[PDB]
Amino acid sequence: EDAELLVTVRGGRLRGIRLKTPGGPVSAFLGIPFAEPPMGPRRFLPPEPKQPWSGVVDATTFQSVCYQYVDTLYPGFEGTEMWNPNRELSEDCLYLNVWTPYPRPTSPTPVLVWIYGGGFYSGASSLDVYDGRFLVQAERTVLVSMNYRVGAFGFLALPGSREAPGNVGLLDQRLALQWVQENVAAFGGDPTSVTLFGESAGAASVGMHLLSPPSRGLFHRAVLQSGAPNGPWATVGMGEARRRATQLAHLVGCPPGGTGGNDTELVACLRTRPAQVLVNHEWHVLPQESVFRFSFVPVVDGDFLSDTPEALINAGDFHGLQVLVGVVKDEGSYFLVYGAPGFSKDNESLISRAEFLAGVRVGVPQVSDLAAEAVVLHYTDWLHPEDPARLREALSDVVGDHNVVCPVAQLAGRLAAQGARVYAYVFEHRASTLSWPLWMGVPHGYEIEFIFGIPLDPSRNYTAEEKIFAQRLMRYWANFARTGDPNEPRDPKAPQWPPYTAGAQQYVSLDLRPLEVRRGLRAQACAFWNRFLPKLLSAT
């Protein structure tokens, strides 16, 4: 046995596995338990720390995926199944992973902590696209990733009650961050230099930890990729969370007629149901036909979030914090084949104007007819109001701006203007191996494979420049993790990445070309979403 595959943490001993890369080996510790299994009476409850164990826990393979819905929209399709669970489902899923360079660093090394996305209803740290061997080998940093409870198991909430307080999936992530503080030094990691990064719901999660005091002391930098905590999908109110939890109980026979009723009896009945039965009725609790909406998400209850993310962002002091935010070029195109009429991944989706007008109500659910008219006015090219291709791109912009780009731009502006040093990007390279149709462009979530250095995998068919592009991206993320600045600490040859300010609003485009500085993250469109539209609904 290689000596560097044996590590002792506060809970006990572990045996890791050596992973191969074209540039050299790395040491990996996959499936480390950080919490007691949230099963039986522990369902819906906050996580408890993992009790110490005897012997050597095997950490050579990923553990189970938390119970979640499995996408069957396109059986056998690479574009969807790459996000589906690649391990067996189980409520015994609170395990984390650690990648560390070989040989192990002798001095403390900055730590990257990945939080996966998936609309808070799906996701796993074991997905092939989250493989941390290439990032750790090329940049010699320590990478951690954890599983957290999703769906009803992580975010079902009867606010006020203690049997189902909600946000327990966020508490799973926090416990994993406390675990990194107490044990990452055993792998050569620096607990004083922890950079969180996540995508979509993971980016929203990273934002929630910035706004939660108990979590803020567990890390020092943040990267939010195509997500923000102030998104219209990332949180729900206490009243709506209670309605969704009560409807899920009704769909699974809780409570039995006629018994009632209060929260203790409701959760007790829910804890007797098999986990798959809860998953099978998760989508049937959404209030209306929609895209980019999820049943069980973090709740604003006054505990984990003392106020709404919007309020905490405005009143927040962010001095001494560095943040890197960004979006992909086509944030909304992915979600249109999940409900927008006239859309299909297997044709050109050249929708009609009638389909566009109906799609706006699906992309912007429960807004007034007047608000929908305002959306149609802003996103219609009135010189070509019936052109199908322009309408297809317009509805993609509607969903992308409303859900991702403008919530991110709002956060980046308030962050920079209130003490934080902010860097912004727009990812504009479409992978040569992308299986989604061409009209989707650069869809939501398809910068991750380049951040993690997946093009370096010799068993895959990326181009030579995509490999160079991936290495340049890993350099950016690692430089930000080490120094808080994506630019090379001395290299003057490479073009510079200027910080994002609420006035200049500078950002860079990430593609095969060298860095290009641009201004305004869709400033005109986001002024409609962030400034005018909220006033349009106040006066109904």
Add this chain to the structure above:
Amino acid sequence: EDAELLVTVRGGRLRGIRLKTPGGPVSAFLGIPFAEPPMGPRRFLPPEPKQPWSGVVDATTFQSVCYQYVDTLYPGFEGTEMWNPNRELSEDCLYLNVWTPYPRPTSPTPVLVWIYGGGFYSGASSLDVYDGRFLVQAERTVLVSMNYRVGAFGFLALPGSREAPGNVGLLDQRLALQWVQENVAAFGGDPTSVTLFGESAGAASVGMHLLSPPSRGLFHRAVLQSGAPNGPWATVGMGEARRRATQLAHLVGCPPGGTGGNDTELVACLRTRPAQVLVNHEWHVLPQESVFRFSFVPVVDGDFLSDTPEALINAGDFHGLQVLVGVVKDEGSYFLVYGAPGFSKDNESLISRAEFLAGVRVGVPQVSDLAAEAVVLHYTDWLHPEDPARLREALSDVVGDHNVVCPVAQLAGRLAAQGARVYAYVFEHRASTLSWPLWMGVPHGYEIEFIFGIPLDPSRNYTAEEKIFAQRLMRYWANFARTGDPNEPRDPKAPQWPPYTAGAQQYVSLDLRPLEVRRGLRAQACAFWNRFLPKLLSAT
């Protein structure tokens, strides 16, 4: 070396396998090719006979399942998974199976030919519930079952065209019947005594072979379980079939933008698409939200069916034919969890009056508001018009009578009154192992396991009484196959099963109790569907 596992047919030599039962072995020949693989340019075309082969074809296991939609409404649930494919999907699927007793019969033995159901969009002869080893062992008959193309591959139709004539899945079954005529003697079977039996869409298939002259000479008796060719779901018009085929082509990008759209180019574009891509858009061509409706079904084009099944049934002479027909006690309950509002398999489905009114429009699609009113009138208990339990059972009766019971009763009456000997039954035993909820009663399709003697399987947990009940039913079906009469010829001690007549309308109840004679296949309700409702729609 058992020589009985080696058989020569017109195409070549085969090697079978011995199957064990508690009562003795049987010889099975699974996966016999009866047609050329309908792949490439042969997609959507009628089948052609399998050309002779050299050597010994292995017939020891089931072959591939025809490409079809896979039910994922309840992952891991036995009630739905039991109908899903248990072999890999392939367009190379035209294979049949024959079970023969051991030792092989020395005198010609009557043949039972099974045609599976599945709404013409799914199904396979390899399903565990269609295991013919117990029926062949206990009753010493020859059992044959075949795969036929389902979905768009079997029933997509551009009527009048040569590239996609339609009904090719029915022609698959006919070719398998011609195969039985030419080869079943090699297994000890009597080609002059062939009894077709099938369930749901298989029963509708059996009925359409009754009404097609080229198929009528290939068999001598018929059993129609919970299905009929005159059902509102079993056939489709030429205009509607063309619209659904053109819509499917549009959803998969056919034809490409800028090219013509005649039938030759449309099918040519469809033949270049991967089979799974066609499956992924099958349900999106139905004209409206509904239950018990399927996209690609037999088409009335004047070829396989010279006229509508209703017309051919009325003007048909059925002298010299014996038919066994029947239904289960709760034909409609299964389909309510697939679209009816307020229904769920995991609760009691105690729907409201408003949900019942909306469910009638789903259960009876495209009827005038006046016609839906007539349905509500007949199926409302006006002394308890808001009782949820009664409304749940009423909507189940609406879907069951409209789609199964009354089409079957209409067929049984016309058959008996026009020369055929008809026997009718109602299956009223709910399996002790049934995984569907109690409120569904005896759902659609759950008499099959008793007809095939599945309770005899030692690895199952059926009761001792259900085993004797299964042996009773297998005797009924085999007696009908041998003599055209389910009653035992050497026997007046058991209760007799009287024939079904258009006047007396006698039938028997099949359950753990001895046979009980009843009169009327829901005569009052079926007079509404078969007599009054057509006149109501004529006057719009």
